A paper describes a structure:
SA1388 was predicted to contain a central PII-like domain and two flanking regions, which together belong to the NIF3-like protein family. Overall, the protein is organized into three distinct structural domains with interconnecting topological connectivities. The middle region of the polypeptide (residues 126–236) bulges out between the two NIF3 domains and is structured as a classical PII-like fold with a (β/α/β)2 architecture, confirming our earlier prediction.
The final model of SA1388 (gi:54040095 Swissprot: P67273;) refined to 2.0Å resolution consists of two subunits in the asymmetric unit. The two SA1388 monomers in the asymmetric unit tightly associate to form a dimer along the sides of the two NIF3 domains opposite to where the PII-domain is located. The PII-like domain juts out of the dimer on the side opposite the dimer interface and forms homotrimers by interacting with the PII-like domains of symmetry related molecules along the three-fold axes. In SA1388, the two entries to the central hollow space are capped by the two PII domain trimers. We observe clear electron density for two tightly bound metal ions at the junction of the two NIF3 domains in each SA1388 monomer close to the protein surface that face inside the hexameric toroid. We have therefore modelled two zinc atoms at the putative active site. Both metal atoms are tethered to the protein through several histidine and aspartate residues. Residue Glu329 is coordinated to both metal ions, while a water molecule, or more likely a hydroxide ion, also bridges the two metal ions. Additionally, we observe a clear electron density for a ligand of unknown identity in close proximity to the two bound zinc atoms that would provide two additional metal ligands, one to each of the two metal ions to complete the octahedral metal center configuration.
Numbering used by the authors:
A (entry chain B), D (entry chain B), F (entry chain B): 1 to 161, 166 to 177, 195 to 370
B (entry chain A), C (entry chain A), E (entry chain A): 3 to 139, 201 to 370
């Protein structure tokens, strides 16, 4: 009997590749509207889950929408037949499930900013503004003959996974010859490590320490990348306008300024431009740039390009490609399509 | 007609104005479509999953609860918890209206209803809101604060003066609306006898009181739900005892040490508004010649079981 | 005379009272010496280094900008960034005056100016401030709220009464001042045609709108600069479209989903106040027989270049 | 000449067994009203120090009351002959001393929740919600021949207490063969360790490090325990109503729900119920449960019992027993009695 | 009678209303029993242990201090620090009353007392509070804001109208109460000569002033204690110099650079209220024919010794 | 061609000896008014940069003022010809540069409080209230034959500066014999250490850890010192009144109290007096003491002397001496003078 993919199965897969925990703590991510128990009939990717996107899912026979922007952000205080209420009610009434992969996708090594850089034809792309992840170096002290079965039992129970220990010789008190064994755990394992250590240790009152270690994460908001060939600011702006099919672009800085290194935060990344320049950027590319921030940037020589917040729409095809690949790996046959609807609230003239 | 949700909302607003609710509250049409024709109305304290099933079973597409099912914003709508209730409403085209603190402060609302279920006399609203009006000024006449704009559009439109002369003088008056009632028994009774009396009249499994059992009670202040914070002011207003729910140890100990008598009839005693609201709505419907069924939900939705 | 900075400040205050500015704003003489004789006045949106160089070159020692060059307090004055501009003003004895939110809310200010550059009709201030006056009371007569003290020093000084009897009755009236204007086109036009029309009239490189291109527009609300926050209220006030700058994605998406039409003419479109303010000041100077040159800065100070 | 116990001596003993530092930082604990210098004539334990409790101390000739709840919590702005003022004035006027052992006793391994679990007849009782205590692993580097007198001097001065060091061999710079010696200190000792190390080290400029270590405390708010035999929620509720002589109990959950593991926070512990369930509880037992929190718990399947906040009264006899034992150990002859007054503000009908 | 603490409190409230104290303050009966008969009253700035010993020694069971011995809530009452004082009061049945900011803003309070000790003329309260009254409205007459309730209970009780028509019109008037006095010397004097004059009249060990020593002084503003924050407003009100205590370096430097003259007479100079309050209370007692001894504490409680 | 000292050069020197980073985060320090590019013609030290001080710089031909107090503290919202505006405009109009060495000088081992103690003739002067500086112990694991060129490359690139490593032998997994090498970095180096380690390590995926270490700083607010000979509080007060030429001093405490150890925070240090007593002070010396704080101190037995905030004026001559010395070391010929103007806003009578 089959194991068709349920929303719960899809969530586990999504979380494996683009962990929901990497989203900012103010964000609203994951299954926003739906039922974990329901079988997935098809997946439509979207930037914003507008009414037209919901109609498109219905029309295609897909019961799952993955959007970048969370349709419910600050809690809803009503669900009436108007505004965002009309969209949420339509999802529910048609048994459509909506998952938001928001700032977790903004900070993912294969996420919105990698996608933007790739669509711009850039090279040497890497994550910037890296998160810090908390780990612990576990240190226990144990007699040499006790070292093996202590290690095997900790390893049998999934610690140091495999069997990754570092062994140090020393003398406790030199009353007692001991082996100081070390290994790494993620922050959530501390309590279980304690349990296992106390349980399988030789000493009645065993001696063990957790030393907090911070490591630079692979996750971070933005990428730094480079153009193949150093070019002028205005030429770079024109090139990316064309590549992303943007109706209008605006830039801040001398039009003939030479550009090689590019920092990109899709959406609304103003606030990071000065740090981007400190990180080596010649220009900071983002959306939703306002007058006074552009004015400040100009006077300080910080070069900007506004590609519009709407340029995050690249994640529809990008996430479709990712998900198709993840599904291939797992041998899952479910269709994924990028929504073709242009959902930009702005029309340019 | 037939009566739509939009028309029901207008009527309810007329009798229990939604603007008398507290600013933090969430009242009105919480879940639904104002264009839908009302098939029947079920009244509820809390809109539980069982209450939604009762509406469906009775053929009613409208529920009016006291407590707002959505209070702080909901950040997801999953098939779990409160999500299940909200999703069931939507999937069955059931409209949910919340008449919350507007009903707590209404002259015919929760506290009137409590006082009447208790058999009390000389019941009056306490803790009255303050309404703002303007005495428009040499002629003079009144206006609601909201008419100030239109009145001026009117005033400045026609007058002999190149610049007509007029004044809006802010006047404040005691509202008919407020949180709680003061009321009285027919004859003085002991605090313990009064507590038992109301236990029995409200069908409460357990009541608790603060104060000597032989304290004599004539004047009673009532705030249904969770009214702790108002007990000192009630005594100030003449109360021999403050009646509310959800009384906690330290608040009761403070009251005891200050000589303030309390009775905890439980928050759940607000359930009286089910039948109370059904009666009101039947009467309002009768005035407007609306032939729509109203029933009080019969489900006991108290999360507590007493032993 | 000759007119000093102190005299100019008095005049500007008379016509565009600095007290109508928002409490968070920074307006008035920001950089300078009130005793210095004005040689000429250059009007500006933003006081950039290029604008200071233009003043110097024209022989003008006074600049009036809309945007305050010093807004939050500056914690240093170095030869870098905004420091360079501030230091250049000081070292060339150039006086800088900021007519900021006081000009945004004036009946002849930024939004009147925008509406006129757009060719609009029936232009009126919206979002009006409220002025406080006192009806002094049996005689009765008016006073500005600021006269309450002096009036009383006067009132209590001479009266038959050992204790004269008098009342100050607070009266509130709609101000002539407020943020934004409502106005109308001569004949209904599509939203896209209106957007293009104003693009052309204001010489804007790029405009963007929210709403169906064939929406019909007659009534228009305008808040120059960054007026998002006021669009729902404008529709409430009758607007078919809200015109402002600095519109961001999520605010535009919200408006679109609620049926609220917008046009982003860019914050930089406040530049119309350069010529607008020059015309006002020339007229005021003419009334007072002041022979001082006023010119609108010709420098395009938009930090954005469009492609 | 005698050393009769003074309030100061009693405070030291109380603090040894139920450290005042384990109280929450918002709490008001310790000697609230009295004189450290005064000789203790007898001790009366209480939940709340009401006027009747003060009269009872006077009547018995006891000059010391230890309550759980602090009679002064937020500061008093007056001391008049009414309300709480009347109680505080009576203490002072009769030279009665009042000590509050409040949240320090809530979190103690022998405190309010252990007492509650014991009175309920539960087994396998352990502290939950454990505090974290900050320690340091001190690391110094020292030549082998210098190791002994360095160690002895640090130990003579009460560090590593005894003589608990761990010894590591290594090469500094291999210009210099060194011994890396390690030991533990509590957080308050850092400065003294620094002093002693600098003082007795071989090197003119000695090399030493303090590495912060967090350890799970023995102190925590609540206990987890189990019934001898799995029973129904309603049967468990009835049993504990009887054992604690409670006039009325209420529960939330299906009456026939099977219960084995019980989390208990006496007083007002709502806020911890969801975490208790994550920790393995079948039911969360507490007091002062309000409607909307009970409603939430019901819909989420979290089972609750309200035993009333007043059920903290078990600490009168419990603390009497503890104190009698502590006094026996120290050979102190001072009487301790649990106040017999029922001080519950509520009467049930 | 004999006069109880409750009666004393009523009298003091009549002459120096406790409601004129700041909302953050702690005034009234701080420590004591309102039912106890007053044996005698000692006045104090700070109620130190030495002042309590003085009361005990004189046979007085009532102390009135300016500064509240309990200000923020006390979290313990031990035989140490302030605990020792509070416990000594209680154990000797001594009643402590604090007349704090109510005395600072009274027309016969701390600042009147300072100005009189200085020999000044034309002394008037400054920084006046605002009292709210209602003109009840065709008859019309006044009421204190507190009478609004009773008046309405009365008003609505008897009238021809089924619904009587009445208005409460909020009127605001300048209070007699406020923080500080303005006053003047008989003849202009230098700032240094004035500072020395007041040093001598108040027996101050050390005074310090801000401003040129030859500045001419006629009009003086005084806020006893720690009145920094009010010096710019005092100059606005006509003061040549602002006199207060507890002046710090940066506040003095700011004043100096702005041309605002100051004198620091020390916070401790509020001690004048001991004799000042004794005289007031003797007079009030004389009016009511109360034969109770009042004495000003003779203890110098300044924590500072000057060298 | 010459390298005359520019403001930028002076700032680097100032920062070397009295690091601007040791200032409190609310403070406003460094070049407040001026141009980094401008050549320094002379330096005038000041407590407060009043108009007279600016006139004095002009008159002397000096274009640089270093003050203790920042003339711009909370941002200026205008620069008009009055008040502080007149002073700032005069600086600018005369091309005078103004640097503030504020709380960095309050906390410096040779700063305001060392200067005060020295002028008082005190002995055994040391910094109190020490800052804590964050460092990292870097730990990498590497095979023995790889140890040399790994070390040399890290050292070639300026880590462990020189060549300060500690070497530990151990077994990774005993599959692999490894050397655990350790060294110290300042907190700002973490990212570069990561770069260098990844770059020059043997392992494709090298194993390395940063362990946060806090060390007691040499910087702190205040000093503790002692009088040569134990003396009475009143005698000490009189002595320091004379030594600092103060017009009036006031003290709190019994006039015959014996004083040996003195804590000093020049300026306005009330808030630290209780901690000073805990640190061993017999008296806390500061300025701007107010009534109620003095009253509190008296009742608690905390002895105080108010030497006035203006007594920070000792830093004019003190900083002149320091700067002359720093300039001598660098062979810089620029004149430094302490402003002679008494800028105390107070006149005493
Ligand atoms: Zn994004
Ligand atoms: Zn976005
Ligand atoms: Zn209610
Ligand atoms: Zn309720
Ligand atoms: Zn504007
Ligand atoms: Zn603007
Ligand atoms: Zn407790
Ligand atoms: Zn408790
Ligand atoms: Zn005062
Ligand atoms: Zn005072
Ligand atoms: Zn300083
Ligand atoms: Zn200072």
């Amino acid at each position: 009997a089959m194991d068709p993919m349920k929303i719960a199965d899809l969530m586990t897969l999504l979380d494996h590749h683009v962990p929901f925990s990497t989203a900012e703590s103010w964000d609203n991510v994951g299954l926003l509207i739906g039922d974990e128990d329901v079988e997935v009939t098809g997946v439509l990717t979207a930037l914003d889950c507008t009414l037209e996107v919901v109609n498109e899912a219905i029309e295609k026979g897909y019961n799952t929408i993955i959007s970048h922007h969370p349709l419910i952000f600050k809690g809803v205080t009503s669900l009436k037949a108007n505004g965002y209420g009309l969209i949420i009610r339509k999802l529910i009434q048609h048994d459509i499930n909506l998952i938001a992969m928001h700032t977790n996708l903004d900070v993912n090594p294969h996420g919105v900013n990698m996608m933007l850089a790739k669509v711009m034809g850039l090279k040497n792309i890497s994550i910037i503004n890296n998160q810090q992840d908390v780990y612990y170096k576990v240190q226990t002290y144990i007699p040499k003959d006790n070292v093996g079965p202590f290690k095997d039992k900790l390893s049998e129970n999934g610690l140091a996974q495999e069997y990754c220990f570092f062994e140090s010789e020393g003398r406790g008190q030199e009353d007692v010859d001991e082996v100081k064994i070390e290994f790494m755990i993620d922050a959530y394992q501390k309590s279980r490590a304690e349990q296992l250590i106390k349980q399988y240790h030789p000493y009645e009152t065993p001696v063990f320490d957790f030393i907090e270690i911070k490591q630079t994460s692979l996750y971070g908001l933005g990428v730094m990348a480079e153009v193949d060939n150093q070019m002028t600011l205005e030429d770079f702006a024109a090139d990316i306008k064309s590549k992303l099919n943007i109706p209008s672009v605006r830039f801040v800085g001398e039009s003939n300024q030479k550009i090689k290194r590019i920092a990109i935060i899709g959406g609304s990344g103003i606030g990071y431009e000065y740090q981007a320049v400190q990180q080596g950027a010649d220009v900071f590319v983002t959306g939703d740039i306002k007058h006074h921030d552009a004015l400040d940037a100009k006077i300080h020589g910080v070069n900007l390009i506004d590609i519009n917040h709407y340029s995050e729409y690249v994640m529809k095809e990008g996430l479709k490609t990712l998900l198709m690949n993840w599904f291939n790996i797992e041998k899952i046959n479910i269709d994924v399509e990028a929504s073709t609807i242009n959902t930009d609230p702005f029309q340019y003239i």
